[PDB]
């Protein structure tokens, strides 16, 4: 038993991280087969950040403007191109530690692990969710651009995020691995801000189920509600509305605890309207929304990976 | 002068459309180089639509289960694979009419052209916008799946949309060409609905500028407002908030008409609070939000394509 913010083991990703230097700018790249992927703003200088013209900036570069280091070994760049907001650097050596992988775009509310890196060197791993406003509340310092987010499905690494920038409010924005931004952000220095965030309701319910599984039951009650009566209350507290598909997804947790989804919604309704009254749930005094139903099952039933 | 809902010329795309049959199900595919792209639900039957397991359904198929027709010529399938929600069928012949192309993911509020097709045969072209709730208000009948949306930048076709399904409200949902859905939709038959839509404010302003350029001036006034006072009123009418980046984007239209953006916002504020009073703007009695600032410049200044 117990319940922790658990990340995926990062070994398979650590062996793909490299350092990319162009001019005086260094950041992290992802080396898979014979291609290194990195944020295209590595080709920018100080004068270019405001209104960069990336097609111009790129035609003015040659392969030898790009220094790529895999630890000590130097990787020779034999070609380069742009795909949306990422740069693809073809190199002469295919990464022998390339895992089975795919590129996937995730949806708001889904979670992933982040391998934070500096100078091509992995520094730490942590779990976060893609927020409904398409930002992540990460932890990133200067030099972390090109760090990646990922999930592991069996033997296969699904890459879903590459880090590009920090917004003024201290939250983080990036792209999928095809270079398409999450959210309405652009890789230049303008006055862009995240829109208002909401709480991920299906995740809060999954976490309440984890609590019951681990022996926290004080918030339960005998009442029941309907989808439309719950969603009416959720709107007022900036909670995402609850769909029939969400109810279906919570099925395995309903089954294991014998507490129906709409039964648990009535407990959530009470918690939103009266607060927690100085009591905690799984060691928290706030309702937690960064665990999916799948995260909970994985941690409260047990699935490993190859 | 004049102002019409204008689509891009479709010739370069018409030559890429093919018909894909698997079993008793036929729909449209996109044939570029030696790959045919189509919705993966072509491999589903009636019993599978509710809860398909696509990895299972695909392993049970072989190359000869897939009939691909380019007009009269038959294309031999020599391999197949899945990328997210699209099927990639490798064929023995590279399309000689493959244009210069790229795959791009668009943002809510951007417009594109749709080439509606049936049985691999192009039927019509029309312009639409990606709505803020990630649906499009298309026009599609049975058999239109795999029809694509695109923009043309100079000589290059940017594919941004492939059609997968119609929602219960009569609006349409699909993926980018890497197979990732726009919006929180899945390719199975569940009870999914679009969230609430909003009006694309920067597009309404661009259209008011087109009106001034074409001689409709009755809605202008001498007042001015601030970004925050406008956005306060826009919230109440379900209009997207206006950013500084939006103001910058409208620059060329401000310059050509000599009417400042915040000046035009005050006219919009009046129109929202008092209505149009039986008058029309560019032949419409409603405020139109499916023209971008770029669409207006293109039509009210003139850019061609190769
Ligand atoms: O390494 C970090 C960092 C990341 C982080 O998350 N937090 C933090 O403090 N620092 N940099 C390096 C430089 N970056 C940057 C460079 C050029 C451009 Cl054009 C842009 C763009 F956003 F405008 F596209 C960004 C932003 C911050
Ligand atoms: O051709 C049309 C059509 C499109 C349109 O836009 N309007 C219209 O009337 N008909 N079909 C064909 C069959 N389609 C379908 C088949 C299997 C699956 Cl699994 C799914 C999925 F959505 F569940 F993934 C959809 C939906 C409607």
Q: Which CATH number do you get for residue A27?
A: 2.40.10.10
Asked if the C-beta of B191 comes within 8 angstroms of chain A's C-beta atoms, the answer is: yes
What φ, ψ does residue A102 adopt, rounded to 5°? -150, 165
In the structure encoding, which two tokens stand for residue B281, read together? 């703007």
Residues of A in contact with B107 (CB under 8 A): 184
* Residue B188 to residue B165: CA distance in whole angstroms: 9
* Residue B87 to residue B41: CA distance in whole angstroms: 9
> Is the C-alpha dihedral spanning B92, B96, B102, B104 positive or negative?
negative
The ligand whose atoms approach the alpha carbon of B141 most closely is 2
Is B15 within 8 Å of B97 (Cβ atoms)? yes
| Distance from the B244 Cα atom to the nearest Cα atom in chain A, whole angstroms | 7
> Is the C-alpha dihedral spanning B61, B65, B68, B74 positive or negative?
positive
CB atoms within 10 A of CB B243: 19
Contact B192 A245 (CB under 8 A): yes
* Residue B178 to residue B181: CA distance in whole angstroms: 9
Is B149 within 8 Å of B112 (Cβ atoms)? yes
CB atoms within 10 A of CB A137: 13
CB atoms within 10 A of CB A170: 10
| CATH number, domain containing residue A207 | 1.10.1840.10
Is B32 within 8 Å of B98 (Cβ atoms)? yes
* Residue B104 to residue A84: CA distance in whole angstroms: 7
Query: Strand A17-22 to strand A25-32: parallel, antiparallel, or no bridges (unpaired)?
Result: antiparallel
| Distance from the A180 Cα atom to the nearest Cα atom in chain B, whole angstroms | 6
Query: Strand A86-91 to strand A148-153: parallel, antiparallel, or no bridges (unpaired)?
Result: unpaired
Residues of B in contact with A180 (CB under 8 A): 104-105, 176
Resolution of the experimentally solved model in angstroms: 2.0
Instruction: Output Rg (C-alpha) for chain B, integer angstroms.
Output: 22
* Residue B297 to residue A6: CA distance in whole angstroms: 51
What φ, ψ does residue B162 adopt, rounded to 5°? -130, 135
Catalytic residue among A16, A22, A85, A145: A145
Residues of B in contact with A184 (CB under 8 A): 107-108
How many residues does the structure list for chain B? 306
Q: What is the DSSP letter of A58?
A: H
Residue nearest (by alpha carbon) to ligand 2 atom 14: B165
Cα maximum dimension of chain A: 69
CB atoms within 10 A of CB B191: 9
In the structure encoding, which two tokens stand for residue A290, read together? 């960064």
> Cα(B16) to centroid of ligand 2, in Å?
22
In the structure encoding, which two tokens stand for residue A164, read together? 């590009």
Minimal-distance CA residue of chain B relative to A248: B190
The single residue listed with the structure tokens 């880090």 is A163
Please work out, in degrees rounded to the nearest 5, the angle formed at the alpha carbon of residue B103 by the alpha carbons of B246 and A162. 70
The SS3 of residue A31 is strand
Experimental method: X-ray
* Residue B64 to residue B51: CA distance in whole angstroms: 25
- Distance between terminal CA atoms of chain B? 23
Is A106 within 8 Å of A130 (Cβ atoms)? yes
* Residue A110 to residue B173: CA distance in whole angstroms: 20
Query: Strand B101-103 to strand B156-166: parallel, antiparallel, or no bridges (unpaired)?
Result: parallel
The pick from A114, A145, A171 for probing ligand 1's pocket by mutation, whose C-beta has the most ligand atoms within 8 angstroms, reads: A145
A145 part of the active site: yes
- Distance between terminal CA atoms of chain A? 23
CB atoms within 10 A of CB B103: 16
Contact B180 A245 (CB under 8 A): no
What φ, ψ does residue A54 adopt, rounded to 5°? -65, -35
* Residue B285 to residue B282: CA distance in whole angstroms: 9
List all residues whose CB is within 6 A of at least one atom of ligand 2: B 41, 44, 49, 52, 140-145, 164-166, 172, 187-189
Catalytic residues of B: 41, 145
CA atoms within 13 A on the CB side of A125: 15
Query: Strand A156-166 to strand A101-103: parallel, antiparallel, or no bridges (unpaired)?
Result: parallel
Q: What is the DSSP letter of A180?
A: P
CB contact set of B1 (below 8 Å; sequence gap of 6+): B213, B214, B215
Is A27 within 8 Å of A143 (Cβ atoms)? yes
Is A252 within 8 Å of A297 (Cβ atoms)? yes
Contact B184 A107 (CB under 8 A): yes
* Residue A173 to residue A130: CA distance in whole angstroms: 10
* Residue A247 to residue B70: CA distance in whole angstroms: 44
Burial class (CB in 10 A: 0-12, 13-18, 19+), A125: middle
List all residues whose CB is within 6 A of at least one atom of ligand 1: A 41, 44, 49, 52, 140-145, 164-166, 172, 187-189
The single residue listed with the structure tokens 């191109």 is A81
DSSP B104-169: ----TT-EEEEEEEETTEEEEEEEEE--TTS-B-----TT-TT-EEEEEETTEEEEEEEEEEE-TT
* Residue B288 to residue B200: CA distance in whole angstroms: 9
Q: Domain of A18?
A: 11-91
In the structure encoding, which two tokens stand for residue A54, read together? 């990336």
Asked if the C-beta of B188 comes within 8 angstroms of chain A's C-beta atoms, the answer is: no
* Residue A61 to residue B208: CA distance in whole angstroms: 42
Asked if the C-beta of B84 comes within 8 angstroms of chain A's C-beta atoms, the answer is: yes
* Residue B149 to residue B114: CA distance in whole angstroms: 4
Which strand (E) or helix (H) includes residue A93?
Answer: none
Residue nearest (by alpha carbon) to ligand 2 atom 11: B142
The SS3 of residue A236 is helix
In the structure encoding, which two tokens stand for residue B199, read together? 């009006």
Contact A105 B192 (CB under 8 A): no
Instruction: Output Rg (C-alpha) for chain A, integer angstroms.
Output: 22
Exposure pattern of A184-213 as b/e (b: 16+ CB <10 Å)?
Answer: bbebbeeebebeebbbbbbbbbbbbbbbbb
Instruction: Report the DSSP beta bridge partners of residue B125.
Output: B115
What φ, ψ does residue B98 adopt, rounded to 5°? -65, 115
Catalytic residue among A41, A80, A163, A172: A41
* Nearest in space to B216 (alpha carbons), one of B133, B152, B274, B300: B300
The SS3 of residue B202 is helix
Instruction: Report the DSSP beta bridge partners of residue A28.
Output: A19
* Nearest in space to B151 (alpha carbons), one of B2, B6, B301: B6
Exposure pattern of B213-235 as b/e (b: 16+ CB <10 Å)?
Answer: bbebeebbeeeebebeebbebbe
Cα maximum dimension of chain B: 69
Contact B105 A178 (CB under 8 A): yes
A64 part of the active site: no
* Residue B83 to residue B51: CA distance in whole angstroms: 19
* Residue A292 to residue A202: CA distance in whole angstroms: 7
Q: What is the DSSP letter of A55?
A: H
* Residue B22 to residue B20: CA distance in whole angstroms: 7
DSSP B234-278: HHHTTBPP--HHHHHHTHHHHHHHT--HHHHHHHHHHHHHH--TT
* Residue A208 to residue A201: CA distance in whole angstroms: 11
The SS3 of residue B24 is coil
Interface of A with B in 127-186 (CB under 8 A): 176, 178, 180, 184, 186
Is B40 within 8 Å of B80 (Cβ atoms)? no
Residues of A in contact with B192 (CB under 8 A): 243, 245
3-state SS, one letter per residue, for B273-284: HHCCCCCCECCE
Burial class (CB in 10 A: 0-12, 13-18, 19+), A41: buried
Contact A104 B244 (CB under 8 A): no
Among A83, A104, A192, beta carbon nearest to B84: A104
Among B102, B180, B244, beta carbon nearest to A105: B180
Contact A84 B107 (CB under 8 A): no
CB contact set of A154 (below 8 Å; sequence gap of 6+): A305, A306
Q: Which residues of chain A form beta strands (DSSP E)?
A: 17-22, 25-32, 35-39, 66-70, 73-75, 77-83, 86-91, 101-103, 111-118, 121-129, 148-153, 156-166, 172-175
Residue nearest (by alpha carbon) to ligand 1 atom 6: A166
CB contact set of B301 (below 8 Å; sequence gap of 6+): B256
Please work out, in degrees rounded to the nearest 5, the angle formed at the alpha carbon of residue B151 by the alpha carbons of B147 and B154. 140
Burial class (CB in 10 A: 0-12, 13-18, 19+), A275: exposed
* Nearest in space to B7 (alpha carbons), one of B94, B115, B103, B144: B115
Find how far residue A266's CA is from the centre of its chain.
30
CA atoms within 13 A on the CB side of B198: 15
Atom of ligand 2 nearest to the CA of B190: 23
Locate breaks in chain A with C to N over 2.5 A; list the residue preceding each. Answer: none
């Amino acid at each position: 038993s117990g319940f922790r913010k658990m990340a995926f083991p990062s070994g398979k990703v650590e062996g793909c991280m490299v350092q990319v230097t162009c001019g005086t700018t260094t950041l992290n790249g992802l080396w898979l087969d014979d291609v290194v992927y990195c944020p295209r703003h590595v080709i920018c200088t100080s004068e270019d950040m405001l209104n960069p013209n990336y097609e111009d900036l790129l035609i003015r570069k040659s392969n030898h403007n790009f220094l790529v280091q895999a630890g000590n070994v130097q990787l020779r760049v034999i070609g380069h191109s742009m795909q949306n907001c990422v740069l693809k650097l073809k190199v002469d050596t295919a990464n022998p530690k390339t895992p089975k992988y795919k590129f996937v775009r995730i949806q708001p509310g889904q979670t992933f692990s982040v391998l934070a890196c500096y100078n091509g060197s992995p520094s730490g791993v942590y779990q976060c969710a893609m927020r409904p406003n398409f930002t992540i509340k990460g932890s990133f310092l200067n030099g972390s651009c090109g760090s990646v987010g990922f999930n592991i499905d069996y033997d296969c690494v699904s890459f879903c995020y590459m880090h590009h920038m920090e917004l003024p409010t201290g939250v983080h924005a990036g792209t999928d691995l095809e270079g398409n931004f999450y959210g309405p952000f652009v890789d230049r220095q303008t006055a862009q801000a995240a829109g208002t965030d909401t709480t991920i309701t299906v995740n809060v319910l999954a976490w309440l189920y984890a609590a019951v599984i681990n022996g926290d039951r004080w918030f339960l009650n005998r009442f029941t509600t309907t989808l439309n009566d719950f969603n009416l209350v959720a709107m007022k507290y900036n909670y995402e509305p609850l769909t029939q598909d969400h109810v279906d997804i919570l099925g395995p947790l309903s089954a294991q605890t014998g507490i129906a989804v709409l039964d648990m919604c009535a407990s959530l309704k009470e918690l939103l309207q009266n607060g927690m009254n100085g009591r905690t749930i799984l060691g928290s005094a706030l309702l937690e929304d960064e665990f999916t139903p799948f995260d909970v099952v994985r941690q409260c039933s047990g699935v490993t990976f190859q």
